[PDB]
Structure formats: structure tokens, C-alpha cells
């Protein structure tokens, strides 16, 4: 079928909260014997790494490769290219990406417990709103006291456009289900957000009867 | 490629907010000559309405169905079916859907605007949050007094299940950006929410400084 080839940016978590932050071009299509070559600009040490040709729909055996430490380059605002060579064509085809423009700090909001919620004295819900930022990219995390939780503790939804006239500017929300007694005794609770424009990273806030 | 049939159940503002809630069978993966069938197991008047060949990754042409006026056996909690038959096999596919069960009714919430937001003067956020509920398909809708807005207006999120034990529940936030000066002035605003489990469709829940 019709091959393709993508550059994936440095997933954001990974680059704010991981250790090797990897950025991926894969070469999607290639429906026929593999056997594909990579070439990235920026090669400086970073010895891009092929993998095993994985397979799609119906047949689009697709094939990948992963350059490793661009975390740096990256933010910098360098410009990652990457050209494949498979056989059934006669040109490389390629890929162009680069940290986005046009950013927009988000703005944080920790949203108290219902108060028809708080008053039924079992699971109160706290909630997180990310509103109107630079690229959909973003990371949401909480914390009881001083302890992150579990991001299998709470919900996050996906970065989604808003109604805006003008800017291109997303949102997001989450939603943290907390026991009572807690908000209750006064233990406190924080939504921290993750974000390319915001400089310190991270934008913290709490909030407590 | 690999033939597959679905059943497609009526959509949900279709049932409560449009005029004739359809329901679709569409048998995909038909990569052949395309001269297809279908088969209701309640037909009565609904006279299903077929459509054009259309296509779709790479080859896998696909072919619909649709059965009109179903808005009423749906609810009422009967099971349609429906098989294919199409040339590239000796054997009709069949697929069967029927309203979703253990229903749990949403829990819907009117969060303040943030306090920080209303003092800049400006664009103040008016969050809802429809939590805990029977199947994902819900319906937000907001009301400025007692004019509903432009669906283009406001951003709502898809439906997520939530961090939970034993029980399927879902959750879903709509994001209203109101003018500072209506909720100062006392410009009340709802938040209407729809769901296959609530008794009259809806629940509203208004609030106003």
C-alpha cells in the first residue's frame, strides 16, 4: 500500500519526568520486502537505532528507527530530519520536525470538591484545569501532601482545542477521586502541570478547606 | 482484506434531541466486487436503506446499511441483528447489538468559577462534570438563563472510564468560557447533561454567584 514516513517528537513526560528521551521516524507502508536505511541530520553520536519490521493494516509492514539523546537538540529548537531508503521506490523519502512555535503558557486551575459532594462524606472530587496553551503537549500529575499518587489514582482527559476566535490554544482537565476524611482532617492537595512553554516546566497549585 | 460486520447503535442525541434516530449495520473489509445484502431480525416498515460503495484503507471498500424508526424497539431493550452477504465467501456475516446493561444514572456537577479567574476581569470558566455513569455516550449541553448555547461555544471531552474498583464507570468535563460581566451581573447558566440511564433523559443543575 502507500508508504509514508513520520518524525515523532520526544514524548513530553519522558523529556520532563524520564531518563533517555527518544525521538522516533517511521517509515509506514513499506509493503514489501524490508530492508529500509535511515539518515538524520543531527547525527552526533546519537547511533539511530532500527527495529524489527512490525506489520500494520492488512499489510503495511512497517519498519522504525530511534535516535537516542536528542532531548537536547530538541529544546534548543534545532530542526530533526530523516530520510528513508527502502526498494520499491527510486527516492528517500523524508521528514522535517521541530520543537513548535507560537507558544502559550497554560494557565492552572484546582477546582474545590463539590459542595453537594463533600457533604455525602465519602469521595470527594477535586479537579484540574490546564486552559488555553502553547502546543496540545502536556502533563498532569498529583500530589496528597508532599506524595505524588499513583497515575493510576486519578483520570486525565486529552488535550482538546477550545472555542477561540483567533489563537489555536488547547485545554485540559483531571479528575481526581479523594476519600473525605482527608479533605476533611486538611490534608492538602496539588495539581502539577507540564508544559514546553512554561519555563520552570512545571506550574504547581494547591488547595485545602 | 479481512471482512468484518458491525452494528452501530442509534446516537444518543439523535434519540433525545434529533428527528429519526437511524441505526447502522455496515460490513467492512468487502475488497471484491461489491453487490452485498442485509437482513434485520426486526423488520417491520423499516424499509432498510442501503448506500454507495465507499472505501477505505488501502482497499478494504465498504458497504452500509441503515434501519429507521429502531428509536423505539432500542429502548424499549430488544436486540437487533443483522448478516451480510456479500461474494467473497458462502457464508452471510452476522452481528448483534442491543441496549448496553448495568446501568449506572451520571452524577452531574456546576464548578465556580475559578476564584482568580473572576477577578481578572475578563473571561471567566464555568466547568461540568458528569461522573460515575451507566454506558460511555452522554450528552452536555449548556444554557445561558434559559437559552441553550452554540455546541460551538463550549469544548466538551470524550467519555473516560474512571480509576475504580468492580464497577465500569465513566466520566466526562465541559469547559464554558462565560463573560465576566454575565456572571457578575447574576446572568445565571446550566448544565444539562444526557444519559441512557436518567428516568426524564436529562438533569440540569444551574448555578450564579
Redesign the interface.
Known sequence: ??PRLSLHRPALEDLLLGSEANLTCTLTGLRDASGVTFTWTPSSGKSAVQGPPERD????YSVSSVLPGCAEPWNHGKTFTCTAAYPESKTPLTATLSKSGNTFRPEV????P?S??LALNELV?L?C?A?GFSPKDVLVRWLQGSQELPR????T??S?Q??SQGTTTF?V?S?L?VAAEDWKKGDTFSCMVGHEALPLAFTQKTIDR
Do not use: N, S
Open positions: 500500500c502507500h493494516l492488512c499489510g503495511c486551575h484546582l477546582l474545590p463539590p453537594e459532594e472530587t479537579t484545569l486552559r493510576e489514582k486519578y483520570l482527559w486529552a482538546r477550545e472555542p485545554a482537565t479528575i477521586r
